[PDB]
């Protein structure tokens, strides 16, 4: 349970979720 | 560290970030 290696995981998870969400929205409008 | 001259800096920073973000979104949809 190392935090110094946990923080990048949450960072990348949030980045991936945000990029997927924006891609979904833009594709839907198109 | 004068606050009376600090507040305009944060105000302009927020304004610039918001305008850039909206421009990005609109350009992406276009």
UniProtKB/Swiss-Prot annotation, chains A, B:
The chain crosses the membrane at residues 4-30. It is found in: Cell membrane; Membrane raft. This is Transient receptor potential cation channel subfamily M member 8. The lineage of its organism: Eukaryota, Metazoa, Chordata, Craniata, Vertebrata. The chain holds residues 951 to 980 of 1104 of the full protein. Expressed in dorsal root and trigeminal ganglia. Specifically expressed in a subset of pain- and temperature-sensing neurons. Not expressed in heavily myelinated neurons. Not expressed in neurons expressing TRPA1 or TRPV1. Disruption phenotype: Trpm8-deficient mice have severe behavioral deficits in response to cold stimuli. N-glycosylation is not essential for but facilitates cell surface expression, multimerization, association with lipid rafts and ion channel activity. Non-selective ion channel permeable to monovalent and divalent cations, including Na(+), K(+), and Ca(2+), with higher permeability for Ca(2+). Activated by multiple factors, such as temperature, voltage, pressure, and changes in osmolality. Activated by cool temperatures (<23-28 degrees Celsius) and by chemical ligands evoking a sensation of coolness, such as menthol and icilin, therefore plays a central role in the detection of environmental cold temperatures. Cooling agents bind within a pocket formed entirely by the S1-S4 helices that opens to the cytoplasm. The coiled coil region is required for multimerization. Belongs to the transient receptor (TC 1.A.4) family. LTrpC subfamily. TRPM8 sub-subfamily. Homotetramer. Interacts (via N-terminus and C-terminus domains) with TCAF1; the interaction stimulates TRPM8 channel activity. Interacts (via N-terminus and C-terminus domains) with TCAF2; the interaction inhibits TRPM8 channel activity.
């Amino acid at each position: 349970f190392p935090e110094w290696i946990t923080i990048p995981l949450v960072c990348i998870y949030m980045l991936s979720t945000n990029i997927l969400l924006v891609n979904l929205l833009v594709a839907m409008f198109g």
